[PDB]
Amino acid sequence: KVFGRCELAAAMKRHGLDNYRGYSLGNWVCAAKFESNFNTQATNRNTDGSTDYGILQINSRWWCNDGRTPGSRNLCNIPCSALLSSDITASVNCAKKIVSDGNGMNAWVAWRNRCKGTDVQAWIRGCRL
Ligand SMILES: [Cl-]
Ligand SMILES: [Cl-]
Ligand SMILES: [Cl-]
Ligand SMILES: [Cl-]
Ligand SMILES: [Cl-]
Ligand code: NA
Structure with missing residues (x-):
């Protein structure tokens, strides 16, 4: 499955990642974007x-x-x-x-x-959460 940006943000929030160990939701969305391009089937x-x-x-x-x-x-x-x-x-x-x-x-x-040190809140801008 290739997630949309806001779709993935909402799923990660439902699963407790927002502010988990102090990392706001945008950090997790940014990481997923650059690790896998939001594709659950990615392997490397x-x-x-x-x-x-x-x-x-x-x-x-x-x-x-x-x-x-x-x-x-x-x-x-x-x-x-x-x-x-x-x-x-x-x-x-x-x-x-x-x-x-x-x-x-x-x-x-x-x-x-x-992602580190950037404005990661941009990754969840506009999303209904
Ligand atoms: Cl994107
Ligand atoms: Cl799920
Ligand atoms: Cl830490
Ligand atoms: Cl954020
Ligand atoms: Cl093994
Ligand atoms: Na192993």
Whole structure:
């Protein structure tokens, strides 16, 4: 599923991400835009053989099991394919664990390079929330 900007904002709000660990909703929408272009089916392979999955590009090196990342962890306790669903629940719940692990949203490279320090409220401007 390719979300619209305001559609995704509303879904993330319903799932408790607005101001989660102090990150306002626009941060999460901005991250998703640059990680996946709002596409739940996005995948990208990394140099070390791990793979990033879904709307927030969660990495199989630590967070999910895809059966092809030897020596990795599965800290969200899910198959990586669950992160590609049209229902964003699994991605949101795993993202909550990631953002709580000490480094905040700096875990998302695209957030750090394209959203951090910008006017992220623009990403939810005009949306009925
Ligand atoms: Cl957009
Ligand atoms: Cl915001
Ligand atoms: Cl594995
Ligand atoms: Cl949902
Ligand atoms: Cl933080
Ligand atoms: Na893994």
